[PDB]
């Protein structure tokens, strides 16, 4: 599995046992996926911050 990076097509390889891709967005303004990488489990949505979790190549 590999995920995206922020702006640049650097992508970001997932380490073993950490094979989601997330992108962290705002609840108030999910315009910019401001944080990005691979995670063990789904980071959960909050009031101020939203996620989308997945598992696909250059998903996120």
PDB file of N, CA, C and O in Angstrom, chain B, residues numbered from 101:
ATOM      1  N   UNK B 101       0.870  -1.188   0.000  1.00  0.00           N
ATOM      2  CA  UNK B 101       0.000   0.000   0.000  1.00  0.00           C
ATOM      3  C   UNK B 101       0.900   1.227   0.000  1.00  0.00           C
ATOM      4  O   UNK B 101       1.960   1.210   0.625  1.00  0.00           O
ATOM      5  N   UNK B 102       0.498   2.296  -0.690  1.00  0.00           N
ATOM      6  CA  UNK B 102       1.169   3.583  -0.644  1.00  0.00           C
ATOM      7  C   UNK B 102       0.074   4.639  -0.568  1.00  0.00           C
ATOM      8  O   UNK B 102      -1.008   4.444  -1.121  1.00  0.00           O
ATOM      9  N   UNK B 103       0.338   5.755   0.108  1.00  0.00           N
ATOM     10  CA  UNK B 103      -0.594   6.864   0.247  1.00  0.00           C
ATOM     11  C   UNK B 103      -0.031   8.074  -0.477  1.00  0.00           C
ATOM     12  O   UNK B 103       1.084   8.034  -0.997  1.00  0.00           O
ATOM     13  N   UNK B 104      -0.808   9.151  -0.510  1.00  0.00           N
ATOM     14  CA  UNK B 104      -0.411  10.417  -1.092  1.00  0.00           C
ATOM     15  C   UNK B 104       0.399  11.218  -0.079  1.00  0.00           C
ATOM     16  O   UNK B 104       0.334  10.963   1.123  1.00  0.00           O
ATOM     17  N   UNK B 105       1.164  12.192  -0.577  1.00  0.00           N
ATOM     18  CA  UNK B 105       1.656  13.299   0.225  1.00  0.00           C
ATOM     19  C   UNK B 105       0.706  14.486   0.057  1.00  0.00           C
ATOM     20  O   UNK B 105      -0.328  14.374  -0.602  1.00  0.00           O
ATOM     21  N   UNK B 106       1.065  15.623   0.657  1.00  0.00           N
ATOM     22  CA  UNK B 106       0.258  16.835   0.673  1.00  0.00           C
ATOM     23  C   UNK B 106       0.139  17.447  -0.722  1.00  0.00           C
ATOM     24  O   UNK B 106      -0.733  17.063  -1.502  1.00  0.00           O
ATOM     25  N   UNK B 107       1.019  18.402  -1.031  1.00  0.00           N
ATOM     26  CA  UNK B 107       1.055  19.089  -2.310  1.00  0.00           C
ATOM     27  C   UNK B 107       1.764  18.263  -3.384  1.00  0.00           C
ATOM     28  O   UNK B 107       1.191  18.007  -4.444  1.00  0.00           O
ATOM     29  N   UNK B 108       3.002  17.845  -3.121  1.00  0.00           N
ATOM     30  CA  UNK B 108       3.850  17.252  -4.121  1.00  0.00           C
ATOM     31  C   UNK B 108       3.479  15.784  -4.348  1.00  0.00           C
ATOM     32  O   UNK B 108       3.067  15.104  -3.408  1.00  0.00           O
ATOM     33  N   UNK B 109       3.620  15.285  -5.586  1.00  0.00           N
ATOM     34  CA  UNK B 109       3.602  13.863  -5.879  1.00  0.00           C
ATOM     35  C   UNK B 109       4.883  13.195  -5.363  1.00  0.00           C
ATOM     36  O   UNK B 109       5.678  12.672  -6.144  1.00  0.00           O
ATOM     37  N   UNK B 110       5.072  13.218  -4.043  1.00  0.00           N
ATOM     38  CA  UNK B 110       6.076  12.417  -3.360  1.00  0.00           C
ATOM     39  C   UNK B 110       5.484  11.087  -2.940  1.00  0.00           C
ATOM     40  O   UNK B 110       6.216  10.123  -2.714  1.00  0.00           O
ATOM     41  N   UNK B 111       4.146  11.024  -2.830  1.00  0.00           N
ATOM     42  CA  UNK B 111       3.439   9.928  -2.187  1.00  0.00           C
ATOM     43  C   UNK B 111       4.059   9.649  -0.808  1.00  0.00           C
ATOM     44  O   UNK B 111       4.934  10.397  -0.372  1.00  0.00           O
ATOM     45  N   UNK B 112       3.626   8.596  -0.120  1.00  0.00           N
ATOM     46  CA  UNK B 112       4.207   8.224   1.150  1.00  0.00           C
ATOM     47  C   UNK B 112       3.933   6.745   1.381  1.00  0.00           C
ATOM     48  O   UNK B 112       2.778   6.328   1.461  1.00  0.00           O
ATOM     49  N   UNK B 113       4.997   5.953   1.489  1.00  0.00           N
ATOM     50  CA  UNK B 113       4.891   4.520   1.685  1.00  0.00           C
ATOM     51  C   UNK B 113       4.355   4.222   3.083  1.00  0.00           C
ATOM     52  O   UNK B 113       4.728   4.888   4.050  1.00  0.00           O
ATOM     53  N   UNK B 114       3.480   3.220   3.189  1.00  0.00           N
ATOM     54  CA  UNK B 114       2.960   2.784   4.475  1.00  0.00           C
ATOM     55  C   UNK B 114       3.871   1.724   5.072  1.00  0.00           C
ATOM     56  O   UNK B 114       4.265   0.795   4.367  1.00  0.00           O
ATOM     57  N   UNK B 115       4.220   1.836   6.361  1.00  0.00           N
ATOM     58  CA  UNK B 115       4.932   0.781   7.047  1.00  0.00           C
ATOM     59  C   UNK B 115       3.997  -0.403   7.298  1.00  0.00           C
ATOM     60  O   UNK B 115       2.775  -0.258   7.283  1.00  0.00           O
ATOM     61  N   UNK B 116       4.590  -1.575   7.530  1.00  0.00           N
ATOM     62  CA  UNK B 116       3.831  -2.794   7.720  1.00  0.00           C
ATOM     63  C   UNK B 116       3.059  -2.721   9.037  1.00  0.00           C
ATOM     64  O   UNK B 116       3.587  -2.265  10.051  1.00  0.00           O
ATOM     65  N   UNK B 117       1.805  -3.174   9.009  1.00  0.00           N
ATOM     66  CA  UNK B 117       0.924  -3.144  10.164  1.00  0.00           C
ATOM     67  C   UNK B 117       0.330  -1.755  10.379  1.00  0.00           C
ATOM     68  O   UNK B 117      -0.133  -1.446  11.477  1.00  0.00           O
ATOM     69  N   UNK B 118       0.338  -0.912   9.342  1.00  0.00           N
ATOM     70  CA  UNK B 118      -0.168   0.443   9.434  1.00  0.00           C
ATOM     71  C   UNK B 118      -0.761   0.827   8.086  1.00  0.00           C
ATOM     72  O   UNK B 118      -0.328   1.803   7.474  1.00  0.00           O
ATOM     73  N   UNK B 119      -1.759   0.059   7.614  1.00  0.00           N
ATOM     74  CA  UNK B 119      -2.006   0.023   6.175  1.00  0.00           C
ATOM     75  C   UNK B 119      -3.365   0.632   5.876  1.00  0.00           C
ATOM     76  O   UNK B 119      -4.120   0.110   5.056  1.00  0.00           O
ATOM     77  N   UNK B 120      -3.675   1.743   6.544  1.00  0.00           N
ATOM     78  CA  UNK B 120      -4.712   2.646   6.066  1.00  0.00           C
ATOM     79  C   UNK B 120      -4.065   3.814   5.353  1.00  0.00           C
ATOM     80  O   UNK B 120      -2.862   4.040   5.487  1.00  0.00           O
ATOM     81  N   UNK B 121      -4.860   4.563   4.590  1.00  0.00           N
ATOM     82  CA  UNK B 121      -4.518   5.927   4.227  1.00  0.00           C
ATOM     83  C   UNK B 121      -5.625   6.790   4.819  1.00  0.00           C
ATOM     84  O   UNK B 121      -6.805   6.518   4.598  1.00  0.00           O
ATOM     85  N   UNK B 122      -5.258   7.829   5.568  1.00  0.00           N
ATOM     86  CA  UNK B 122      -6.166   8.871   6.034  1.00  0.00           C
ATOM     87  C   UNK B 122      -5.816  10.205   5.374  1.00  0.00           C
ATOM     88  O   UNK B 122      -4.705  10.387   4.875  1.00  0.00           O
ATOM     89  N   UNK B 123      -6.772  11.134   5.375  1.00  0.00           N
ATOM     90  CA  UNK B 123      -6.508  12.547   5.135  1.00  0.00           C
ATOM     91  C   UNK B 123      -7.329  13.366   6.133  1.00  0.00           C
ATOM     92  O   UNK B 123      -8.550  13.220   6.200  1.00  0.00           O
ATOM     93  N   UNK B 124      -6.665  14.228   6.909  1.00  0.00           N
ATOM     94  CA  UNK B 124      -7.301  14.985   7.978  1.00  0.00           C
ATOM     95  C   UNK B 124      -7.775  16.333   7.433  1.00  0.00           C
ATOM     96  O   UNK B 124      -6.976  17.118   6.922  1.00  0.00           O
ATOM     97  N   UNK B 125      -9.078  16.595   7.544  1.00  0.00           N
ATOM     98  CA  UNK B 125      -9.738  17.791   7.061  1.00  0.00           C
ATOM     99  C   UNK B 125     -10.435  18.508   8.232  1.00  0.00           C
ATOM    100  O   UNK B 125     -10.465  17.977   9.342  1.00  0.00           O
ATOM    101  N   UNK B 126     -10.993  19.700   7.999  1.00  0.00           N
ATOM    102  CA  UNK B 126     -11.695  20.471   9.024  1.00  0.00           C
ATOM    103  C   UNK B 126     -13.187  20.243   8.930  1.00  0.00           C
ATOM    104  O   UNK B 126     -13.702  19.958   7.850  1.00  0.00           O
ATOM    105  N   UNK B 127     -13.894  20.364  10.049  1.00  0.00           N
ATOM    106  CA  UNK B 127     -15.337  20.201  10.012  1.00  0.00           C
ATOM    107  C   UNK B 127     -15.923  21.475   9.437  1.00  0.00           C
ATOM    108  O   UNK B 127     -16.859  21.470   8.637  1.00  0.00           O
ATOM    109  N   UNK B 128     -15.320  22.573   9.891  1.00  0.00           N
ATOM    110  CA  UNK B 128     -15.743  23.923   9.610  1.00  0.00           C
ATOM    111  C   UNK B 128     -15.429  24.277   8.163  1.00  0.00           C
ATOM    112  O   UNK B 128     -16.091  25.132   7.573  1.00  0.00           O
ATOM    113  N   UNK B 129     -14.417  23.622   7.585  1.00  0.00           N
ATOM    114  CA  UNK B 129     -13.912  23.972   6.268  1.00  0.00           C
ATOM    115  C   UNK B 129     -13.047  22.852   5.677  1.00  0.00           C
ATOM    116  O   UNK B 129     -11.840  23.039   5.520  1.00  0.00           O
ATOM    117  N   UNK B 130     -13.632  21.691   5.345  1.00  0.00           N
ATOM    118  CA  UNK B 130     -12.949  20.581   4.698  1.00  0.00           C
ATOM    119  C   UNK B 130     -12.625  20.925   3.239  1.00  0.00           C
ATOM    120  O   UNK B 130     -13.108  20.266   2.319  1.00  0.00           O
ATOM    121  N   UNK B 131     -11.806  21.958   3.038  1.00  0.00           N
ATOM    122  CA  UNK B 131     -11.312  22.368   1.739  1.00  0.00           C
ATOM    123  C   UNK B 131      -9.914  21.783   1.546  1.00  0.00           C
ATOM    124  O   UNK B 131      -9.605  21.245   0.482  1.00  0.00           O
ATOM    125  N   UNK B 132      -9.067  21.887   2.578  1.00  0.00           N
ATOM    126  CA  UNK B 132      -7.689  21.421   2.534  1.00  0.00           C
ATOM    127  C   UNK B 132      -7.529  20.162   3.399  1.00  0.00           C
ATOM    128  O   UNK B 132      -7.766  20.225   4.605  1.00  0.00           O
ATOM    129  N   UNK B 133      -7.131  19.019   2.815  1.00  0.00           N
ATOM    130  CA  UNK B 133      -6.614  17.886   3.564  1.00  0.00           C
ATOM    131  C   UNK B 133      -5.233  18.260   4.101  1.00  0.00           C
ATOM    132  O   UNK B 133      -4.231  18.140   3.397  1.00  0.00           O
ATOM    133  N   UNK B 134      -5.190  18.715   5.355  1.00  0.00           N
ATOM    134  CA  UNK B 134      -4.046  19.432   5.903  1.00  0.00           C
ATOM    135  C   UNK B 134      -2.984  18.473   6.437  1.00  0.00           C
ATOM    136  O   UNK B 134      -1.814  18.840   6.538  1.00  0.00           O
ATOM    137  N   UNK B 135      -3.384  17.245   6.779  1.00  0.00           N
ATOM    138  CA  UNK B 135      -2.501  16.221   7.307  1.00  0.00           C
ATOM    139  C   UNK B 135      -2.799  14.909   6.595  1.00  0.00           C
ATOM    140  O   UNK B 135      -3.933  14.655   6.187  1.00  0.00           O
ATOM    141  N   UNK B 136      -1.767  14.075   6.449  1.00  0.00           N
ATOM    142  CA  UNK B 136      -1.777  12.933   5.558  1.00  0.00           C
ATOM    143  C   UNK B 136      -0.753  11.906   6.009  1.00  0.00           C
ATOM    144  O   UNK B 136       0.350  12.262   6.426  1.00  0.00           O
ATOM    145  N   UNK B 137      -1.118  10.630   5.926  1.00  0.00           N
ATOM    146  CA  UNK B 137      -0.196   9.533   6.116  1.00  0.00           C
ATOM    147  C   UNK B 137      -0.971   8.242   6.296  1.00  0.00           C
ATOM    148  O   UNK B 137      -2.148   8.150   5.947  1.00  0.00           O
ATOM    149  N   UNK B 138      -0.286   7.238   6.851  1.00  0.00           N
ATOM    150  CA  UNK B 138      -0.840   5.913   7.051  1.00  0.00           C
ATOM    151  C   UNK B 138      -1.016   5.680   8.535  1.00  0.00           C
ATOM    152  O   UNK B 138      -0.231   6.178   9.341  1.00  0.00           O
ATOM    153  N   UNK B 139      -2.046   4.924   8.904  1.00  0.00           N
ATOM    154  CA  UNK B 139      -2.407   4.757  10.295  1.00  0.00           C
ATOM    155  C   UNK B 139      -2.853   3.308  10.490  1.00  0.00           C
ATOM    156  O   UNK B 139      -3.199   2.623   9.527  1.00  0.00           O
ATOM    157  N   UNK B 140      -2.842   2.848  11.739  1.00  0.00           N
ATOM    158  CA  UNK B 140      -3.175   1.493  12.133  1.00  0.00           C
ATOM    159  C   UNK B 140      -4.682   1.295  12.027  1.00  0.00           C
ATOM    160  O   UNK B 140      -5.138   0.361  11.366  1.00  0.00           O
ATOM    161  N   UNK B 141      -5.460   2.164  12.671  1.00  0.00           N
ATOM    162  CA  UNK B 141      -6.913   2.140  12.603  1.00  0.00           C
ATOM    163  C   UNK B 141      -7.406   3.518  12.181  1.00  0.00           C
ATOM    164  O   UNK B 141      -6.678   4.506  12.276  1.00  0.00           O
ATOM    165  N   UNK B 142      -8.650   3.572  11.715  1.00  0.00           N
ATOM    166  CA  UNK B 142      -9.374   4.798  11.434  1.00  0.00           C
ATOM    167  C   UNK B 142      -9.216   5.840  12.551  1.00  0.00           C
ATOM    168  O   UNK B 142      -9.649   5.580  13.673  1.00  0.00           O
ATOM    169  N   UNK B 143      -8.612   7.008  12.287  1.00  0.00           N
ATOM    170  CA  UNK B 143      -8.758   8.149  13.167  1.00  0.00           C
ATOM    171  C   UNK B 143     -10.212   8.627  13.082  1.00  0.00           C
ATOM    172  O   UNK B 143     -10.763   8.735  11.987  1.00  0.00           O
ATOM    173  N   UNK B 144     -10.834   8.912  14.231  1.00  0.00           N
ATOM    174  CA  UNK B 144     -12.275   9.125  14.301  1.00  0.00           C
ATOM    175  C   UNK B 144     -12.590  10.612  14.152  1.00  0.00           C
ATOM    176  O   UNK B 144     -11.801  11.464  14.560  1.00  0.00           O
ATOM    177  N   UNK B 145     -13.748  10.919  13.564  1.00  0.00           N
ATOM    178  CA  UNK B 145     -14.184  12.290  13.370  1.00  0.00           C
ATOM    179  C   UNK B 145     -14.427  12.965  14.718  1.00  0.00           C
ATOM    180  O   UNK B 145     -14.853  12.316  15.674  1.00  0.00           O
ATOM    181  N   UNK B 146     -14.156  14.270  14.794  1.00  0.00           N
ATOM    182  CA  UNK B 146     -14.413  15.093  15.963  1.00  0.00           C
ATOM    183  C   UNK B 146     -15.229  16.314  15.542  1.00  0.00           C
ATOM    184  O   UNK B 146     -15.689  16.396  14.403  1.00  0.00           O
ATOM    185  N   UNK B 147     -15.405  17.260  16.466  1.00  0.00           N
ATOM    186  CA  UNK B 147     -16.348  18.342  16.249  1.00  0.00           C
ATOM    187  C   UNK B 147     -15.670  19.290  15.289  1.00  0.00           C
ATOM    188  O   UNK B 147     -16.270  19.765  14.325  1.00  0.00           O
ATOM    189  N   UNK B 148     -14.401  19.556  15.573  1.00  0.00           N
ATOM    190  CA  UNK B 148     -13.631  20.567  14.895  1.00  0.00           C
ATOM    191  C   UNK B 148     -12.907  19.972  13.684  1.00  0.00           C
ATOM    192  O   UNK B 148     -12.750  20.647  12.667  1.00  0.00           O
ATOM    193  N   UNK B 149     -12.466  18.714  13.784  1.00  0.00           N
ATOM    194  CA  UNK B 149     -11.648  18.051  12.776  1.00  0.00           C
ATOM    195  C   UNK B 149     -12.389  16.836  12.245  1.00  0.00           C
ATOM    196  O   UNK B 149     -13.052  16.128  13.003  1.00  0.00           O
ATOM    197  N   UNK B 150     -12.278  16.590  10.935  1.00  0.00           N
ATOM    198  CA  UNK B 150     -12.891  15.447  10.302  1.00  0.00           C
ATOM    199  C   UNK B 150     -11.780  14.649   9.636  1.00  0.00           C
ATOM    200  O   UNK B 150     -10.750  15.203   9.252  1.00  0.00           O
ATOM    201  N   UNK B 151     -11.997  13.347   9.503  1.00  0.00           N
ATOM    202  CA  UNK B 151     -11.134  12.473   8.738  1.00  0.00           C
ATOM    203  C   UNK B 151     -11.944  11.853   7.605  1.00  0.00           C
ATOM    204  O   UNK B 151     -13.173  11.917   7.601  1.00  0.00           O
ATOM    205  N   UNK B 152     -11.242  11.254   6.646  1.00  0.00           N
ATOM    206  CA  UNK B 152     -11.762  10.123   5.899  1.00  0.00           C
ATOM    207  C   UNK B 152     -10.682   9.046   5.917  1.00  0.00           C
ATOM    208  O   UNK B 152      -9.535   9.306   5.551  1.00  0.00           O
ATOM    209  N   UNK B 153     -11.048   7.834   6.344  1.00  0.00           N
ATOM    210  CA  UNK B 153     -10.192   6.654   6.366  1.00  0.00           C
ATOM    211  C   UNK B 153     -10.563   5.791   5.162  1.00  0.00           C
ATOM    212  O   UNK B 153     -11.669   5.904   4.633  1.00  0.00           O
ATOM    213  N   UNK B 154      -9.646   4.932   4.729  1.00  0.00           N
ATOM    214  CA  UNK B 154      -9.738   4.153   3.503  1.00  0.00           C
ATOM    215  C   UNK B 154      -8.656   3.054   3.596  1.00  0.00           C
ATOM    216  O   UNK B 154      -7.889   2.994   4.557  1.00  0.00           O
ATOM    217  N   UNK B 155      -8.624   2.197   2.571  1.00  0.00           N
ATOM    218  CA  UNK B 155      -7.488   1.325   2.232  1.00  0.00           C
ATOM    219  C   UNK B 155      -7.348   0.950   0.727  1.00  0.00           C
ATOM    220  O   UNK B 155      -7.846  -0.067   0.244  1.00  0.00           O
ATOM    221  N   UNK B 156      -6.613   1.880   0.024  1.00  0.00           N
ATOM    222  CA  UNK B 156      -6.278   1.902  -1.423  1.00  0.00           C
ATOM    223  C   UNK B 156      -4.982   2.676  -1.820  1.00  0.00           C
ATOM    224  O   UNK B 156      -4.581   3.605  -1.119  1.00  0.00           O
ATOM    225  N   UNK B 157      -4.340   2.285  -2.941  1.00  0.00           N
ATOM    226  CA  UNK B 157      -3.084   2.859  -3.452  1.00  0.00           C
ATOM    227  C   UNK B 157      -3.278   4.301  -3.918  1.00  0.00           C
ATOM    228  O   UNK B 157      -4.072   4.555  -4.825  1.00  0.00           O
ATOM    229  N   UNK B 158      -2.559   5.248  -3.308  1.00  0.00           N
ATOM    230  CA  UNK B 158      -2.687   6.673  -3.587  1.00  0.00           C
ATOM    231  C   UNK B 158      -4.156   7.095  -3.451  1.00  0.00           C
ATOM    232  O   UNK B 158      -4.731   7.689  -4.363  1.00  0.00           O
ATOM    233  N   UNK B 159      -4.748   6.777  -2.297  1.00  0.00           N
ATOM    234  CA  UNK B 159      -6.156   7.042  -2.017  1.00  0.00           C
ATOM    235  C   UNK B 159      -6.441   8.533  -1.847  1.00  0.00           C
ATOM    236  O   UNK B 159      -7.349   9.083  -2.470  1.00  0.00           O
ATOM    237  N   UNK B 160      -5.646   9.172  -0.991  1.00  0.00           N
ATOM    238  CA  UNK B 160      -6.182   9.993   0.082  1.00  0.00           C
ATOM    239  C   UNK B 160      -5.944  11.469  -0.183  1.00  0.00           C
ATOM    240  O   UNK B 160      -6.334  12.312   0.626  1.00  0.00           O
TER     241      UNK B 160
END
